[PDB]
Amino acid sequence: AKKALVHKANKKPKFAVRAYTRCNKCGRPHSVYRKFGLCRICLREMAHAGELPGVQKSSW
Amino acid sequence: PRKGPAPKRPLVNDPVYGSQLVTQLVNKVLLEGKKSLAERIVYGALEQAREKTGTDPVVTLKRALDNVKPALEVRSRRVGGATYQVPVEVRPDRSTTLALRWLVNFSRQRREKTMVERLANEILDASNGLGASVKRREDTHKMAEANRAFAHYRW
């Protein structure tokens, strides 16, 4: 992710329809969860490291 | 099958009459898993055949089954680059299963504009010896008698 573009997206857009997610840790535009604010791979890494309070392996 | 013979399901008997043949017939005619609808089809066709023929439905059912059940079947195998047909006897259970299968398949392809009618007419034709199932069994026995020369393979 280009840092120019990620900072630009963080900057308040001139219109309300120009806002989107941009995963914070890595700035991936696609495949990002709204609740956590992190993308697929970031969620994977945090969960496997166990540093995210509440995520765990699922097996039912 | 490689390890050995698998167990066979304990089929239950029909409460309306008391014949497992009716249960087998409804199971064979089942289409898209509509058990009640298939049972209604079978009961309606049976009642129509009964009112057309003026006889006992179960009696005519066993008559047709005994008339159309086969005794010999043809199997295919290749020896020395040539594909040959080998006939072999068939057990009574599989004979009855094939008889029911043939009945259903040749009831499928009639032109009476109504399936509840076509099934009853096919049953009547099988009972009286004018059925497509009867013709199929004729052809099967003819082929077996024609190609039984290779019986020495015994496979």
């Binding site: 039912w60 | 409460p15 309306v16 009640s36």
Partner: protein, 126 residues
């Protein structure tokens, strides 16, 4: 007071026996009105026929969850259990018949990578 319960595919039923007549009350309606299927009537009445004690027991049913077949199975199991509880004498014969044994099969897990249950997606070597 006497009580029993039966289960089949999330179908939980309540059954209480009374020494009255042979009437069946299912949520305030008769057996013919509720689930009018010959299969259901025969499966519900089978244990009573096996015991051969017809028309002196009244049952009242409160139902929740499951489907028609599941509820029918739960009811038959519950009435068999109540029969055994009230008269343990016929327990050997009824168990041999096979009505007191719970049926431990239901919808199984759906596994990722497939369409549902156990069905394998269209897998081609092309």
């Amino acid at each position: 007071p006497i009580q029993t319960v039966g289960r089949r595919k999330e179908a939980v039923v309540r059954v209480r026996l009374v020494p009255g007549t042979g009437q069946f009350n299912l949520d305030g309606r008769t057996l013919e009105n509720y689930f009018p299927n010959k299969v259901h009537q025969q499966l519900i009445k089978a244990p009573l026929v096996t015991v051969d004690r017809v028309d002196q027991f009244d049952i009242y049913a409160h139902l929740d969850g499951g489907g028609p077949s599941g509820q029918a199975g739960a009811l038959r199991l519950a009435i068999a259990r109540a029969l055994i509880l009230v008269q343990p004498e016929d327990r050997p014969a009824l168990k041999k018949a096979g009505f007191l044994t719970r049926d431990p099969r239901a919808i199984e897990r759906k596994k990722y990578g497939l369409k549902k249950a156990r069905k394998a997606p269209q897998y081609s070597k092309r």
